Ligand binder design. Structure first.
Ligand SMILES: Nc1ncnc2c1ncn2[C@@H]1O[C@H](COP(=O)(O)OP(=O)(O)OC[C@H]2O[C@@H](O)[C@H](O)[C@@H]2O)[C@@H](O)[C@H]1O
Ligand SMILES: Nc1ncnc2c1ncn2[C@@H]1O[C@H](COP(=O)(O)OP(=O)(O)OC[C@H]2O[C@@H](O)[C@H](O)[C@@H]2O)[C@@H](O)[C@H]1O
Ligand SMILES: Nc1ncnc2c1ncn2[C@@H]1O[C@H](COP(=O)(O)OP(=O)(O)OC[C@H]2O[C@@H](O)[C@H](O)[C@@H]2O)[C@@H](O)[C@H]1O
Ligand SMILES: Nc1ncnc2c1ncn2[C@@H]1O[C@H](COP(=O)(O)OP(=O)(O)OC[C@H]2O[C@@H](O)[C@H](O)[C@@H]2O)[C@@H](O)[C@H]1O
Ligand SMILES: [Mn+2]
Ligand SMILES: [Mn+2]
Ligand SMILES: [Mn+2]
Ligand SMILES: [Mn+2]
Lengths: 384, 384, 384, 384
């Protein structure tokens, strides 16, 4: 069919100070006890208590679960579901980056569907809406506060599982850039390059629509102008607010268009080595774009212009090549590792990695359909 | 504040055949009896019964209220609320164009907050969310299946009141282009030019954000290419699908950025003389743009390029004027009336029309703030 | 469906001297006696006997029917079927322009399907293929030596009936440019502008395919260069050969894509006043192109370039308008009448002319679907 | 002489689902049982039975001959005539690529003329038309469903003989893109580049006409955009349909313009080593183009533009040179071998390969007339 759908939370708050509304919103939802899912760093920095104060200052109780781990695991989700159940909670508030949103989302799905998070790996495999959730985002690259995606790790298959289900669209989303000033430069760069990967893969995806296209183009332009500014000075408020907008645009686009083999392979490198998601995407992006070039050359040529390149007097092909060169230049200027072996990757895993990548749902929307030898060759090119 | 929010239904279905899902979707909400709000023409066409059959084949009861009138009235809403309660309905399904959507939204809001619809004229004045509502759109220009706007006419004041409330965001939207092939050319032109007005006013609004900008730009570009095609041949499926996308983009843009004095004045001409909304917008747009030019000249110059104009070697001012000339050219090619006098408007009503235009909420986001005399001059110029 | 088809004779001869092969070819078909259908002018010029000698010198008998009239009539077809049967002919050879080709096609169809040519007005209504027919084309504009179209006049309805049937595709075609040198200048101009109309209407028709587009583009480019040369000096052999190629390109294109309201209206003016077909087409072309503009503005802009115009720095709309101006200038340079009233058309018939125009099959493929009032407007415009 | 001719089947069906008509169309022709000529691969995939049912449901009997081999052989034709005479068949339906079309065509010719296939090597070396044949094409190259060319391999001389006879033009053709979705990527690339070779050799051929030029230009332009997309994802329906159009355009063009030394040499390399026809053409295309440059420098400069290259500020020579560079880049991006020795070509057979190529009929239309040394040198340059 030629049918499509657009998903996002019904209410999404933006701008400096929006977090000061969480409690009121939680009260309007008619909830009484919320599990605060955050990470140990943000809890140690004091964010958990500062936000809990706002929540309980509105008549809703909150119990903090600062046990969401970068690249969240099935163990984190099971332990959280116990907290949720033992702690008599009726809502979830996620505070942090994509790991906290996805952990809270998985907890919320299993708290309403019963099984294990692994049971819902795939597309809309769940059979009921998740418990009420307000997602407070503090990184500029996931968009998970708006998506129907939750990435939970199989520690046994060592695979970052993709649960893509409409029932994990958060109830309300909050994007406060004042909460993002504290991102160190490497984190700023990695999340920003994850948003850029989101927008590029959404723009070349087979599930693209004119709506997702509008959003992705804006995201690329804004990231290209403001991400280096956010990496160079995290106290540049303009760059922070524009990167928050760019992150939401890119999340909006990929949620409804689909991603591709950058994310398909990155999920395997992250399930095997706990590498940062955004760094995997940044290392892989130029190679997968070069692989995809012959399928979407006009759109990669447009991406080169969106990325600031001059394409006057150039063929569509040469213009498309300037886009890969600009991506490599951006990654070089933001100090992204050059390959995966310098980070700890091994050949004895490449074939397994490639075989697992061909099973990720994101691969379904990649514009060029590959043979195992191609995924393997891409992974080999990303080793050095 | 630098704070903002983005609102839209959590689930939005697109594409040929999407209406065949209404019953299952309505069932998933756990509702049991829906009032089907439509107009007399579409009910006489058999569409009401087709949709009622799909709904009943999913275990939900249906009571048809086919009495929404073009420019729906407070009387239509009161009668609809009476029907809603007499048949013990727990949900609403709107089928048709903006008049049916707004009648249904108003019925649902009054059924959940009490009072009368006039009580909610303004911005976020109600306290409770409206009863479950699914919106099935059949015109390519309103976007009300996605907006928090319901425009109901005060018959006594002769004023099309604008109720701007987050609580009238539909639960789910359905945009099936197969349901729009039957629009006669005049309706296609008026609805398409209402969507173009939506996108333009959103782009020049004081409430614009990078997100709304993305959506509005795509809407203008698509309307410029496909609206004349849809007017020339309504059986052009590609044009119908692109207009279905453009109408939704423009709705998404104005719902979250705001409108301006085109809509503020159009609501008064429609409350006084019951003209088609899009025809009022098409007549007024060049005049409000010229009035607004000095406030957003860079953005009107960009609009000229989005509309296909060549601006090489021109100042921003001359490029912005070329946009007004292109807007005038599209209206003439779509056989839009030249002015309001030949339609029946009277000079002695101008002063009241302008006064009421300054009380509409859409005027709050107009980039240039007028005084009464300038609103009067605009209406006099629009008499022609 | 997206299904399509390409129709053309299996063998099509081109080049100086090709007619000297007709007799051999007729004999290769296994036929024994052919009815030579031509018009009185070429018969008085001696061409009928010259070709009959070539045919007889190969053992095929010939009976000349020089009774085909410009804008052939139903009476011509009845008289031809009588001769075909009385003279014990088993094949048909048409010699001349479109009038002779269509008369021969009609006789050949009725000789195999019975009934009357009137019964076959419309699309693929016939059950049996027509008797073997070889078409020798002597004008540079109709293309009927290759098409599945036969235009026969219903003398009482005063309507040029369009029989579009695959069973009237000639068996073999001969396009000898040596036979076209004798066309007087007005005939060269009228047939060439009928070919230009074929290519333009094929390019903007809703039934265009990449194949028809390729042929139509080539036709337009060649006509812009060589038609004026062939009108200014009919002894320019290069111009005559290039115009023969262009007529065939335009015929192949319209035969498989469709025409539009130029032909739909021209058939009515020709059935009422027996004006030359190409003159009717040339008078109407600018007005129907202007009416259709909003439906195919990109393709009319491309036509402006094919016609040699410079479109640098122009919007698609201004470029499309330059094409209409180029058509008007060419028609003026070839002494094409400015309007229809000066030739004898009467206002009191416009309504009938319009109503009959909406019943012609060529109207089905026009890119803009009109109303009766708009067809009437096109004619009033073409009257003065 | 200045004479020319255009040949193609009188009825040619295109588009998704056209194959569903084979049976009904076989019903027109009045035939009773057809030998279904295909290859073992499509027979093992089930296509043979699928089509056979469509033929059965129209009252026509079918005998499947799935013994056509890639690079069909004389032996294959004899086995075929044996079965068509045995099952007492009166028609032939070819299902597959160029090998199935050419095998069936040869069977149909010898079944009507009696001799041996080797005897009709050359041009118009036959006396009577072949038996009714409908060709259903499943590859995006060759064009054999429309040509008067049958290439049968003589197992003795190791020579792909080119029989160019009008008596082998199929009765009806079917180009259903739904049957081409299953072509694996290497087959998509090889067939598409065989089509590109057809269009280029037709464009630079000495037998080119304005008609062949129109068709070949369109084919080159479409291939440049859609062949890489069809190789990258064979489930791209738009790319498959556009390539089906392109292969038909290139077939119509080369059939009536001629080919050149790319095909002349490729036929010998394939007769010696059974290499795929399209891979032979792709390896040879740049070297023969460079040999031909001085004869057709303007048309190679035009091909550079048709292929998407920018030629601004360049001499005709440098642009024609950019065209060969674009052909090389296309061959490399679609993984086409760089030379023939890697595939197994022998440096001892170069003298015979070159001598046999100058005896191919395809060399007669090459724009540059060479010496044996030149053909030898081309083959040597294509060895590494
Ligand atoms: N505003 C902030 N200031 C300082 N540090 C922060 C901030 N926000 C997050 N951090 C720190 O950044 C670390 C990484 O947190 P993540 O949530 O894992 O980062 P993110 O890229 O946003 O999420 C990625 C996760 O979502 C999936 O899409 C993806 O596969 C991965 O599982 C954590 O230790 C967290 O404390
Ligand atoms: N697909 C269709 N086919 C044929 N007719 C249709 C179709 N859809 C609607 N119509 C007819 O068009 C007429 C106008 O109906 P509206 O709902 O008023 O059309 P629309 O322009 O979309 O809504 C305008 C209303 O919404 C507000 O934004 C605006 O202020 C106005 O009140 C009605 O009589 C309706 O039957
Ligand atoms: N080569 C020629 N030299 C001199 N005179 C010629 C030549 N060819 C044709 N004529 C003269 O041109 C006159 C008109 O002949 P037509 O066949 O009517 O001209 P043409 O434009 O080719 O066909 C028009 C007919 O075909 C339909 O498409 C169209 O509707 C019309 O009925 C005739 O009197 C004929 O003698
Ligand atoms: N739609 C399809 N799906 C899957 N496989 C296919 C399809 N079509 C063809 N194939 C496979 O392609 C293989 C080669 O078949 P060919 O007919 O030889 O391919 P093609 O390139 O079209 O023909 C080449 C032959 O025609 C001559 O012009 C040329 O000289 C050569 O002999 C076979 O194994 C066949 O099964
Ligand atoms: Mn990501
Ligand atoms: Mn509006
Ligand atoms: Mn004509
Ligand atoms: Mn070939």
């Amino acid at each position: 069919n030629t049918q499509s759908a657009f998903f996002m939370p019904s209410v999404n708050l933006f701008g400096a100070g929006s977090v000061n509304e969480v409690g009121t919103r939680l009260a309007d939802l008619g909830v009484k006890k919320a599990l605060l899912v955050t990470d140990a760093g943000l809890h140690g920095l004091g964010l958990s208590e500062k936000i809990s104060s706002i929540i309980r200052a509105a008549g809703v109780e909150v119990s903090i679960f600062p046990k969401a781990e970068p690249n969240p695991t099935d163990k984190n989700v099971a332990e959280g579901l116990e907290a949720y159940n033992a702690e008599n909670c009726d809502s979830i508030v996620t505070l942090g980056g994509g790991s906290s949103h996805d952990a809270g989302k998985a907890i919320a799905l299993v708290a309403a569907n019963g099984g294990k998070i692994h049971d819902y790996e795939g597309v809309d495999v769940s059979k009921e809406p998740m418990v009420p959730l307000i997602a407070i985002n503090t990184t500029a690259g996931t968009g998970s506060e708006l998506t129907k995606f939750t990435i939970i790790t199989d520690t046994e298959r060592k695979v970052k599982m993709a649960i893509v289900d409409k029932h994990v669209t958060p109830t309300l989303s909050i994007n406060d850039p004042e909460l993002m000033v504290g991102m160190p430069p490497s984190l700023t760069a990695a999340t920003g390059l994850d948003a850029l990967t989101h927008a590029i893969e959404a723009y070349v995806s087979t599930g693209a629509t004119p709506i997702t296209d509008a959003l992705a183009i804006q995201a690329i332009k804004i990231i290209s102008k403001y991400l280096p500014r956010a990496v160079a000075n995290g106290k540049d408020i303009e760059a922070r607010e524009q990167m928050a907008f760019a992150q939401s645009l890119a999340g909006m686009a990929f949620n409804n268009a689909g991603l591709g083999y950058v994310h398909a392979i990155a999920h395997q490198l992250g399930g095997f080595y706990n590498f940062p998601h955004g760094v995997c995407n940044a290392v892989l992006l130029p190679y997968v774009c070069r692989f995809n070039l012959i399928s979407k050359v006009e759109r990669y040529a447009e991406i080169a212009a969106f990325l600031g390149e001059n394409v006057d007097g150039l063929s569509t092909y040469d213009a498309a090549e300037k886009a890969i060169k600009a991506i490599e230049r951006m990654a070089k200027d933001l100090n992204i590792p050059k390959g995966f072996k310098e980070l700890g990757a091994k050949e004895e895993d490449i074939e397994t990695l490639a075989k697992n990548a061909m099973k990720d749902a994101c691969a379904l929307t990649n514009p060029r359909k590959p043979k195992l030898e191609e995924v393997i060759q891409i992974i080999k090119n990303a080793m050095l």
